[PDB]
Amino acid sequence: TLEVWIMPNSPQPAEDFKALVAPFEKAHGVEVKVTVLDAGVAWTKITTAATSGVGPDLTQLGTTWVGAISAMGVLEPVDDVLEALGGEKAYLPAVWRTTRLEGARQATAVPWFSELRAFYYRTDALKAAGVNPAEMFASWQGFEAGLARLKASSFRDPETKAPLAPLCTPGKNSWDVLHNAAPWIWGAGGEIVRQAGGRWQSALNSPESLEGLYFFLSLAQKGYVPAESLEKNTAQIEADFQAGKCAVFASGPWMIQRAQVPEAKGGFAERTAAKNLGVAPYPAGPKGRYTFFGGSNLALFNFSKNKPLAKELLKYLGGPEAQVRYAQMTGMLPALRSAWSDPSFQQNPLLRTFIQAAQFGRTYPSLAGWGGVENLAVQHLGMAWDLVAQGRLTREALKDLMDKASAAINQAL
Ligand SMILES: [Cl-]
């Protein structure tokens, strides 16, 4: 037997994983036990397995968890598994970076699936405002000009009979506050952290990062984002878009599967939003186009009693067949690049657009103390969102907050 710990990734988490690995059990004559760790308790349970030497053979890790657990010295190297799956060239650079602690020699984590963000849009609403998708998602100037025309439009949703908000985004009350901001920081030529003389420090208060953050946050201050959206998390914003209240909003590939499922089974197929759905990658900032990448990897604990067999399951789960099947179950992109060419993606132009958005993929450095950097950053971005909510965000007040964030991050590093 093998023990594997997963987070709730698919609609029926345990049943789904059991169906995924059944062919592996059959061909190797073993049983895979799965335990599903709810999101609230997953980190603490993995941390306790790390410090006590008691736990599974394999655990799922968020991509941003790899540094912290790798640094604890409890993970088995998996360079052999990654070679067997095709090595560095088999993965997007942003994904390959999540296979180790930043700067380490040995890989400690096998890519499993990628979460990435692009913009969904109402094809009917942009048509009715005289906006070409190609123009609005080409550049920052184009994006804001598009929201201006969308705000001025007399378009009504055929079901609500009400106007559409030009843009829906969460503020501070979501799990992805930094992820929402990151494409705007990067695209301005900035970054969250910068390496200097082998040490790491905050770049959040660099002029480039500030031009990025201000461009994004000021959109909600200029009447393109409803007040009520800033109170909500990404899941609730998805629901607003499904209900026909938003012309534009960012999320992952899973929305495409949902647009094909009836409301009665948790989809929105019947809604106008589903029948008039477009997808475009994030617009190009002044210094390039970037797509935020997260998701989950699998690691092998070095106290495991069946490392060789657990590595065969890592090759299985990371490899072409399981990569395709699990991406469909989770509504995510496969981590393995070669799985992108399977007909279940290639037959769906909206999925093909996510594949093209993937080409601009970037993620955060795999730092041991990434959790701390992200929490201090989000805390101060949260205070910036509060000023946006009151129409009182200025370039000067943002800089003051990102200075305080920088002082605290540099101390935690
Ligand atoms: Cl960064």
Task: Give your account of this protein's structure.
One of its GO terms (cellular component) is ATP-binding cassette (ABC) transporter complex, substrate-binding subunit-containing. One of its GO terms (biological process) is maltose transport. This is Sugar ABC transporter, periplasmic sugar-binding protein. One of its GO terms (molecular function) is maltose binding. There is one protein chain. Helix 1 runs antiparallel to helix 15 (320-330) and helix 18 (370-389) runs antiparallel to helix 19 (395-412). Strands 1, 2, 3, 4, 11, 12 and 13 form a 7-stranded mixed sheet that branches. Strands 6-9-5-10 form a 4-stranded mixed sheet. The two termini are 41 Å apart. The protein is 44% helix and 15% strand. Helix 1 links the parallel strand 1 (2-6) and strand 2. It is built from 19 helices and 13 strands. It binds chloride ion (CL). Chloride ion (CL) binds at residues 191-193, 364.
Structure summary, number of beta strands? 13
Contiguous helical run count: 19
Percentage of β-strand residues: 15-25%
- Counted up, domains total 2
Structural class assignment:
alpha/beta
**Biggest sheet descriptor:** 7 strands, mixed
What general outline do the C-alpha atoms trace?
globular
Q: Identify every distinct bound molecule in the structure, by name, code or SMILES.
A: chloride ion
Separation, N- and C-terminal Cα atoms? 41 Å
